[model samples]
Target: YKKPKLLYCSNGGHFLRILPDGTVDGTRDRSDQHIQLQLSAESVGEVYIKSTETGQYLAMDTDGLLYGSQTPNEECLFLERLEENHYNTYISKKHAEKNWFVGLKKNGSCKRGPRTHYGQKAILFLPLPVSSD
Candidate 1:
């Protein structure tokens, strides 16, 4: 029962989890990327990106419910909203029984520009259910 990592970005971009080797495990395309786990009211996490083109983003739950917020947590740090922008990841809680939780960083050279130049790192998380299986 591994917990799935969660990721979100501006302009409806996101990624759920990455491989143990630091490769992004989910779809690489911005549109195809999405948060993997189903979320409840209690399953609150944050998303950080390297851009700020948009002031806020709309989050769609597995149930299709849409919620808007000023990018969660450290997201505000990098608000430029550029493509292929690199972000640092973090999680609020670590699952003891699960090997996979949110907040895993990837390996690679991040794109250069205003997004990565300022020294701001992004972060996001997933809302876990009682059973993460």
Candidate 2:
């Protein structure tokens, strides 16, 4: 219940929802149940983006794809930080060869990791408290 944050995509104005089946999507309404995300802080900037429903970890794969993993590995670690734009960014920690950001398209679809980058509108997210009005 605590440490839950709704990852709100700034570009699409959607809430990132992680389903029990490991499907990741962005929903327009906060009323969506899957929008609840429980994140964990590990090393300095490392964060584990977990689905509160199933406790699965969200990770960037070898092919620069975002997938849910059963266990936390190096690929599951993400660098979390806030930018000058006052928005947050999560980049895969293991793959330094190319930065892989947790991305959501403007139309509320998943953006592949290789195409995601800093300063991209869809790459920026707001860590909103889970309470809804």
Candidate 3:
């Protein structure tokens, strides 16, 4: 099995972050606690994303909005899909019927919406190089 990784947005050139206000966005400045994430296995093909900064887990509401929760549940679980481009896409296990993927808007805000093929903004995932230090 492949190890979990931190998600970086190619459009914004930043790391995905879950803010204190429960807002999901990207950070270009640096990879601090807010930008660091822990992708842990939840099931056979699912994982739970946790914010290192706030100790909260990433969850999606029925309304198709992304947020951070203090306690993780089924809504916090996601399935990682490997794309043809060699980048992995995350889909919410709670809202699979809608084909929701963790997407990004033009303004760099995170969006939990329908998947759009060939849409760069809608599927941003760049791998960060491991630090030697």
Candidate 4:
């Protein structure tokens, strides 16, 4: 599943992006500076999100912390859950103890290990149009 998409947080309409220093955050404006993620299927319901800008995969540590890594390891895998609301959610494969999912905080920062899925801060996966150029 080599699909490219932009992860938008349902909380404040921000896009999940990675900075040059590998800091992951959310941006309000739809700018070209955001990270373009290419998802590759690792299992039936799991994927590996690689950033096109930095060539790093979205990863989480054992402590339920988020980071960007150059290599796709076990902590880099995420289980994809499709909700009835037509939104896709990602749960960390590394931090299964707390059922941590990728989310956005009120301050436009990335949140890991959010216990609930019904919150407004939940992350939503959406398609990004490929440029004709």
Candidate 5:
């Protein structure tokens, strides 16, 4: 049951997210950006999520922990890069908060950023185009 949740090997359709706690979590088997995390530039970074109110932003802490914040700290920025075997990897950018991969664990739990890397199976392929309703 693809219950709107999470991660290993960067599955083809599942998506990525971070909750208010310390995590870089995952979405359903059928990843949908429109509802999971609606994108907004947020002026500082290219990430801000949601469909309407309480719009949350995914931010990173200095130790590379990811969490959601309604008030941006410039730390909640997710940038992408290509990793081993050309899989897409998400990471934090900015000269200050630089480090860590937006990686979840093999059990689909939030993984600490510093410990995450592309060489590992931490790459999340992201939700491809929503082909149907």
Candidate 6:
């Protein structure tokens, strides 16, 4: 596989996922929540989901938009490449807002294990907040 590149759309906030085969997956607007995405080249192509809210758009690879919620401060949106296997996950700015961490802890956990039922594993993968830098 080649290095991944982010395709930034001219629009304000529309989450999109592009597969290695040039396939595109995305959603329009969603509530100010984290947009979740699950992708498997061998299994399913890709899956998209978001919280039930109008006028909200999904943010790819991180927490969705922050449309001012019950706890807006807890929302973080960013992605970082891990040194181990190069798998990316969401990283929060402050430790207090770490609840957004979502994703499979293991390889097959997202499909066959107890994590199969978790939406985070199927989608978000890992939660990291956008960096200030």
Among the numbered candidates, top TM-score falls to 2
TM-score (C-alpha, index-matched) for candidate 1? 0.23
lDDT of 1 at 50: 21
Clashes of 3: 0
- How many backbone clashes are present in model 1? 9
Q: Determine which window of 10 residues in candidate 6 has minimal summed lDDT.
A: 107-116
Model 6 over residues 1-133: C-alpha lDDT tens digits? 2212221222333443322332233334234333333221222322222222221122323333212222212232233324254344433222214444333322221111222123443333432223345
**Tens-digit lDDT track for model 3 on 1-133?**
2333456655645656566676656666454555555676667778677655553466678625666646545577767777786776667667676666655542366654644334545565654433445
Query: Of 1 and 5, which scores higher on TM-score?
Result: 5
RMSD of each candidate?
Answer: 15.9, 3.2, 3.9, 3.7, 6.1, 14.5
Cα lDDT computed for each candidate against the true fold: 0.29, 0.64, 0.59, 0.60, 0.47, 0.29
- TM per candidate comes to 0.23, 0.75, 0.72, 0.71, 0.52, 0.24
lDDT of 3: 0.59
lDDT tens string, model 2, 55-101? 34665666367666365345666788778867777776767546556
Model 3 residue runs over 4 Å out of place are: 1-5, 53-56, 105-107, 114-120, 127-133
How many clashing pairs in candidate 5?
A: 4
Evaluation by lDDT, superior candidate among 2 and 4: 2
TM-score, ranked from best to worst: 2, 3, 4, 5, 6, 1
Per-residue lDDT tens digits of candidate 1, residues 1-133? 4433344422223343322332232334334323343322232343333212322243222211222343333312221221343533332222212322222221222111223222323223232322454
Which ranges of candidate 2 are over 4 A from the true structure? Answer: 1-3, 54-56, 69-74, 131-133
- What is the overall TM-score of model 3 with all chains considered together? 0.72
- Give the lDDT of residue 132 in candidate 1: 50
| Sliding window of 10 residues with minimal summed lDDT for model 1 | 104-113
